[PDB]
Amino acid sequence: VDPVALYETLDRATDKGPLRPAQEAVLGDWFKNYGKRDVIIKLHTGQGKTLIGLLILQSRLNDNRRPCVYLCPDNFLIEQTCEQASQFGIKVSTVEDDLPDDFLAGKSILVTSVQKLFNGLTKFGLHRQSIEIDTILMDDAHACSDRIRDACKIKIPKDEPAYHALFKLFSTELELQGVGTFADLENGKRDALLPVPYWAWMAKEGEVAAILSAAADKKSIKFTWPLLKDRLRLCQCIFSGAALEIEPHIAPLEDFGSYARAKHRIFMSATVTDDSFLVKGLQLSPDTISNPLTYAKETWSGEKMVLIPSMMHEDLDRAKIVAWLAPVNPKLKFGIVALVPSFARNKDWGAYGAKTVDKDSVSEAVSDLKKGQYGTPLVLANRYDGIDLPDNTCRVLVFDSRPFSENLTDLYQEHCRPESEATLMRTIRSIEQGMGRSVRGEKDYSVVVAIGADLVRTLRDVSSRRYLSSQMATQIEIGLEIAEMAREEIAAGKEPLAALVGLINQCLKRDDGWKDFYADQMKKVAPKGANKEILELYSRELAAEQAYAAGDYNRAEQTIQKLLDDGLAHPDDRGWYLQERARYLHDGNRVEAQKLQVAAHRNNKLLLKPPTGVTVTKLTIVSQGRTERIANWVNKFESYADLDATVSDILGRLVFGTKAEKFESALNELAFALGFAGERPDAEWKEGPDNLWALNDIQYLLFECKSEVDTTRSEIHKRETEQMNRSAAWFDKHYLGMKVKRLIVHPANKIQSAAAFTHEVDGMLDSNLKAFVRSARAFFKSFENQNLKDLSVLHIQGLIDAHHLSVDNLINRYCSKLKNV
Ligand SMILES: [Ca+2]
Ligand SMILES: [Ca+2]
Ligand SMILES: [Ca+2]
Question: What InterPro entries does this protein map onto (predicted)?
Answer without folding.
Answer: ATP-dep_Helicase_C, Helicase/UvrB_N, Helicase_ATP-bd, P-loop_NTPase
